[PDB]
Structure 1
Amino acid sequence: MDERDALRISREIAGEVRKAIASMPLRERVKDVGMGKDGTPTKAADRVAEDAALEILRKERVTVVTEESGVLGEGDVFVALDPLDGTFNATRGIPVYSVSLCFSYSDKLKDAFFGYVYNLATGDEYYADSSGAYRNGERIEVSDAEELYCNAIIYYPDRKFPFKRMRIFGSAATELCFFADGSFDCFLDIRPGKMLRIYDAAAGVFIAEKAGGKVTELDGESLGNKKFDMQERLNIVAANEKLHPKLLELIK
């Protein structure tokens, strides 16, 4: 499988997940239907999105790591799949939720070759491959803001901060793309518990890096050894290379 295959597969998944979610009324979406392998409830919306995505991925030689059903398959290409990132928004009809896919040539983030995030409510498509990062077919890149007085997505502000704006939209995959395309100057997830899972973050991280972003753990450490399994957890500090070290200093 190469990056062109992955783009084709991701688009087919986006089309099916979008159709499955769009037809589901909110009351239906909101219902709990089971306990996910991640340890949080699976909503009906999560289940139909995942079934639609897995029906396509099952035909490929992959090992899938996905929120509700866990680790499936034995293939050599690993796929971190979030079939519905921003479930809370989706169940409320708040239009910021996405299907997220990151393809890697091993079970580690450093071997990623493709990242894809599709906003299921707006139809915005973000992806990245060896040729760069894209939003709806157009090349994107992170902003060049150098000052802490900037536009930040941050989980969570717990002290007085110097940002021009702080936002929290409820969908890390999409928000990492908001950072990738320069809509926001940085993305931080500095929650002490380390809450992000590999499938929440992997595609956005890859897309943001291809867009020129520096993206690391809390202390500036590489994300390369983050594993595609259910146990993996991440904090994230993401910004252009000039702003990034100022952020690291700020959160100390």
Structure 2
Amino acid sequence: MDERDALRISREIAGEVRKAIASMPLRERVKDVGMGKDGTPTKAADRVAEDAALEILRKERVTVVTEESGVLGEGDVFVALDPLDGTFNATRGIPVYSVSLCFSYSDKLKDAFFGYVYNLATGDEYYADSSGAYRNGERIEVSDAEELYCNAIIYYPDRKFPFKRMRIFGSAATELCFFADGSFDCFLDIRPGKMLRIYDAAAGVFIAEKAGGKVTELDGESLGNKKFDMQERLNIVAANEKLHPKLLELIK
């Protein structure tokens, strides 16, 4: 498979996935209807999203890692896919939830070759191949923010914070693309329990990085050997190369 393929497939699934949900009333979205392989409940939207996202990516040959359905496939290539990031927003009809496909030639994040987040309430499009990162056709790049008094997104503020502004929108995938295009000066998942799964942020990272971004763990060590498995989880700090050492500093 090629990085051109991933778009092709990512865009099919995005369209399919968007519509299934578009036609599903908020009353219908919020009903729990099962429990996921991830060990969390399944909402009705989640259900339809998966099934849509999974009718396509099963037509292909990959090893796709998902929530409701666990690890399926034998494929050479691994896809960390979430067909509806921010279910609570969707369930609410609050327009911050997307599809998030991340493909890799190997088992680890290091061998990522395409990232793709699509807002299914807006139809906004974020992806990145080996030729940059884009927000709907035009290429993106992070931000020259040099100091901490900056517009940041954080999970979760616990005390005094120098930031120009903080935000929590409810879609870490989406959010990580908010960073990537200059909207925010960083992303922060500092939740000591470490509660971000690979399908949760694998993509978002990739594009942020492709947009020129310092995206690491709490210790600033690489994320490269993160796993397309269900038990993989991560904390996240992301900013431009020159901001990072301070927030690293800062929250240390």
TM-score, length of structure 2 as denominator length: 0.99
Residue 19 of structure 1: aligned partner:
19
Which SS does the other structure have where 2:102 is aligned? strand
Which SS does the other structure have where 2:166 is aligned? strand
Residue 64 of structure 1: aligned partner:
64
1:201 deviates by 0.3
Q: Residues of 1 paired with 2:220 and 2:194: CA distance?
A: 15
1:59 deviates by 1.1
Q: Residues of 1 paired with 2:52 and 2:222: CA distance?
A: 33
1:93 deviates by 0.7
Which SS does the other structure have where 1:165 is aligned? coil
Deviations 1:86-134 (A, max 9, x none): 0000000100000100000011000000000000000000000000000
1:82 deviates by 0.6
1:251 deviates by 1.0
Residue 175 of structure 1: aligned partner:
175
Q: Residues of 1 paired with 2:107 and 2:45: CA distance?
A: 27
Q: Residues of 2 paired with 1:227 and 1:105: CA distance?
A: 12
1:67 deviates by 1.1
Q: Residues of 1 paired with 2:129 and 2:36: CA distance?
A: 30
Deviations 1:196-234 (A, max 9, x none): 000010000000000001100001010001000000000
1:56 deviates by 0.1
Deviations 1:134-166 (A, max 9, x none): 000001000010100000000011111100100
Residue 142 of structure 2: aligned partner:
142
Size of the aligned set, in residue pairs, is 252
Residue 229 of structure 1: aligned partner:
229
Q: Residues of 2 paired with 1:200 and 1:152: CA distance?
A: 19
Which SS does the other structure have where 2:116 is aligned? strand
Which SS does the other structure have where 1:96 is aligned? coil
Matches within 5 A, 1:85-104: 85-104=85-104
1:61 deviates by 1.1
Q: Residues of 2 paired with 1:249 and 1:40: CA distance?
A: 34
Q: Residues of 1 paired with 2:169 and 2:68: CA distance?
A: 22
Residue 202 of structure 2: aligned partner:
202
Q: Residues of 2 paired with 1:173 and 1:77: CA distance?
A: 21
Q: Residues of 1 paired with 2:174 and 2:68: CA distance?
A: 19
Which SS does the other structure have where 2:152 is aligned? strand
Q: Percent identity?
A: 100
Query: Which runs of 5 or more structure 2 residues have no equivalent in the other structure?
Result: none
Q: Say whether residues 1:132 and 2:132 are aligned partners.
A: yes
Which SS does the other structure have where 1:167 is aligned? coil
Q: Residues of 1 paired with 2:25 and 2:232: CA distance?
A: 33
Q: Residues of 2 paired with 1:214 and 1:203: CA distance?
A: 15
1:248 deviates by 0.5
Q: Residues of 2 paired with 1:196 and 1:72: CA distance?
A: 20
1:49 deviates by 0.4
Which SS does the other structure have where 1:179 is aligned? helix
Query: Which runs of 5 or more structure 1 residues have no equivalent in the other structure?
Result: none
1:83 deviates by 1.0
Q: Residues of 2 paired with 1:41 and 1:146: CA distance?
A: 41
Q: Residues of 2 paired with 1:250 and 1:233: CA distance?
A: 23
Deviations 1:17-37 (A, max 9, x none): 000000000000000010011
Q: Residues of 2 paired with 1:144 and 1:38: CA distance?
A: 37
